[PDB]
Amino acid sequence: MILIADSGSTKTHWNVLDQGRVIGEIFTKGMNPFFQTPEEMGREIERTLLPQLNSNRFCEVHFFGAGCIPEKVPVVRNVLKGCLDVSSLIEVDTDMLAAAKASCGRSPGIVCIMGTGSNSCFYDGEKIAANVSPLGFILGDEGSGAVLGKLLIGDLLKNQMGEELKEKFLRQYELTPANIIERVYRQPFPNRFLAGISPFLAENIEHPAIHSLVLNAFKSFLTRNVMQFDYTRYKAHFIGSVAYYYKDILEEAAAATGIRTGTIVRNPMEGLRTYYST
Amino acid sequence: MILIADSGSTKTHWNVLDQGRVIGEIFTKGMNPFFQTPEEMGREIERTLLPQLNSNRFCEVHFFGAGCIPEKVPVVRNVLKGCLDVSSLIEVDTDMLAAAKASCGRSPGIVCIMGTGSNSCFYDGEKIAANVSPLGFILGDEGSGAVLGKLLIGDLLKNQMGEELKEKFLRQYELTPANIIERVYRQPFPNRFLAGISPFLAENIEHPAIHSLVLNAFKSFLTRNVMQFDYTRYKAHFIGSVAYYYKDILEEAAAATGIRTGTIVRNPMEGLRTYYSTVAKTV
C-alpha cells in the first residue's frame, strides 16, 4: 500500500492506494512545519489520520506540503517514520511538486497553485527547476484566495463597489468593519479568514465590479509570476480551489496575457493517483 | 502656557507655547490608547515627558492622537489630568483634527494624513464631518509609508525592479527574504518595519520604477479616498512625512486625478502654533 498526502493551509488531503485502487481518502488539519512542532504534527496524525487507516504499514509514503523545504524535510520525515511502519520510502517535498506531478507527470510545464495561497514554478519533468517565491498574502500571493479576500474587503469597505455588495457581504458573513479589522490584524491566520470570505466573489461573479476584481487579480498573478518562466514554450497548469472556482476568468486572464493553459483542476489528488498507479 | 501634542504611530510631538512663543519642543513615544493601557501611558509621560518640562502647570492642553475616538477621549484626558496641572480645558481629539486645524484653521477643506498610515476626511471648519476609514496597511492605507514599503518589497523580491535595486536594498538594510518574511508575518508592528524601509524610495526616486511605484500608490490614495469628498470644490491638504518627502509626486498625482492641493507640510505643529496664536487665540 502507498500513502499520499497533499498538505495546504486549511487542510491535508490523504489517499491510500493499494494494487492501484483507492482504498482510503482522508482529510486532516494542514501540517506545515513552520506553524507546528513535530510533537503537534505527530499528535494530529495519531488523533485524526490513524483512525481512518487500515494499517500502520506502508510500502511508500509521499508527503507533499507547503513549508516542506529542504531545511524542514528531515523533521517531517521523522514524524512520519515514528507514526507509520514504512518498508521502502518516505518522500517529503512541497505542495508545488505534488501539483507538478499531478498535472505534468514526467514531462515539463509551468505549474501554478491557486488556493488559499498561490505559487508558481517551472517543472522539468522530474523536479522543480525554478520558482517565484510567493511572499504571502500581504506582499504577494497574487490571485490567491486570501488576496482575493483582501482586495474584496478593501474595495467593499472603501465604498468602491457601492452599497449593495458591501451590505450583502457584511450581512451574509455577519461581519462589521470592526470585526473585520480585528480578524485581519489581531487574530491568528488572517490569510485563512480572508480566503474563507472569498467565495462571495464566485457567488456574485456576474456583477462588473466582482468580475473585474477577479480578472485583474488573475492578470496580476500571471504577469508577476508565470511570465517569469518561458510561457511561450510551455503550457501553464493550475491546481487549487481558486483555479477551479474561477476557471472561466482564469482562462480569460490567460488569453489576455498570452499564456497557454494546460490542466486546470481543483486539487492534485486525482493527478497523483494517476501518477502512482500508471 | 499651553501644551500641544500630535500623537502618531512612531512618536508624539509636543510643543509648549508661552504667550504665543514656542518655549519647549519634545518627542515621546506614540500614545495610541488602543495600543497601550492608561497605566502604560501615564508611566511613559512620567518617564519621558515630565523630565523635559520645567513646569507641569498649563492653562490649556490640546492633545491630538491616533486612536483618540470619543470612547477614548476621557481615558486619555484622565491620564493627562493625573500628570499635568491644568486650569482650563483638556481637549483630546484625533490626529485628523490636528491636521485639519493646522491646515484649514476655521475654514472647510479636505484634510489628509500621509505618514506611517494614511487617512482622509472633510473638515467643516469646526470639526471632522466625514471620514474614509483607512483600513490599515493590509486592506488600505493607500500611499502610506507602510503601504509604500509593502509595494516596494513585493516588487523587489518578485524581480519587478531588477537585481541592482534588489541587491542595493537587501545590502542597505542588512535584510534577506526569509528575514523580511519573518518581520512582515510573524513579528510585532510589521507596518512600522515597512514604513521604516520606505525611505529607500525617496533615496532612489530618480529610478523610473521607484518613481512609478510612488505615483501609482498616490493616485490610488486619491482615487480611493480623497475623491469620495467634494474634491472639485474643496482643496485637499496633506500632512505627514510621506506628503512631505514625496511632495512633487503627490503634486503630480493630484494634477493627474483632478485634485486641487492646499497645504503640504511635514507635520501639523507649525499650523497648530498659528492656530492657537492667532485664529483661535483665547482672548
Numbering used by the authors:
A (entry chain A): 2 to 279
B (entry chain B): 2 to 284
Quote the study on this structure.
Unlike other bacteria, the pathogenic Tannerella forsythia, a member of the red complex group of bacteria associated with the late stages of periodontitis, lacks biosynthetic pathways for MurNAc production and therefore obtains MurNAc from the environment. Sugar kinases play a crucial role in the MurNAc recycling process, activating the sugar molecules by phosphorylation. Structural and sequence data showed that MurK and K1058 both belong to the group of ribonuclease H-like kinases and are members of the ASKHA (acetate and sugar kinase/hsc70/actin) superfamily.
We obtained triclinic crystals for MurK (termed MurKapo), which contain four protomers in the asymmetric unit (ASU) that form two biological dimers. A detailed Cα-RMSD analysis of all four chains in MurKapo showed that both protomers of a dimer possess a virtually identical conformation that is slightly different to the second dimer of the ASU. The dimerization interface of the apo enzyme buries a surface of around 1160 Å2 and involves just two residues (F34 and F35) of the N-terminal domain, whereas all other contacts to the adjacent protomer were made by several locations on the α-helical insertion of the C-terminal domain. These include residues in the helices α4-α9 and the loop region in between β8 and α4, as well as residues in the loop region α10 to β9. Soaking experiments with MurKapo crystals using MurNAc failed, probably due to a rearrangement of the N-terminal domain upon substrate uptake ultimately leading to severe crystal damage. The induced fit of MurK can be visualized by superposing the C-terminal domain of the unliganded MurKapo (“open” conformation) to its corresponding C-terminal domain of MurK/MurNAc (“closed” conformation). The best fit utilizes residue range 106 to 266 and results in a Cα-RMSD value of 0.67 Å for 152 aligned residues, showing virtually identical backbone conformation of all the aligned residues of that domain. In the open state, the adjacent protomer does not contribute to the neighboring active site, but the induced fit accompanying the MurNAc uptake enhances the reshaping of the active site by rigidifying the dimeric interface with additional contacts from the N-terminal protomer.
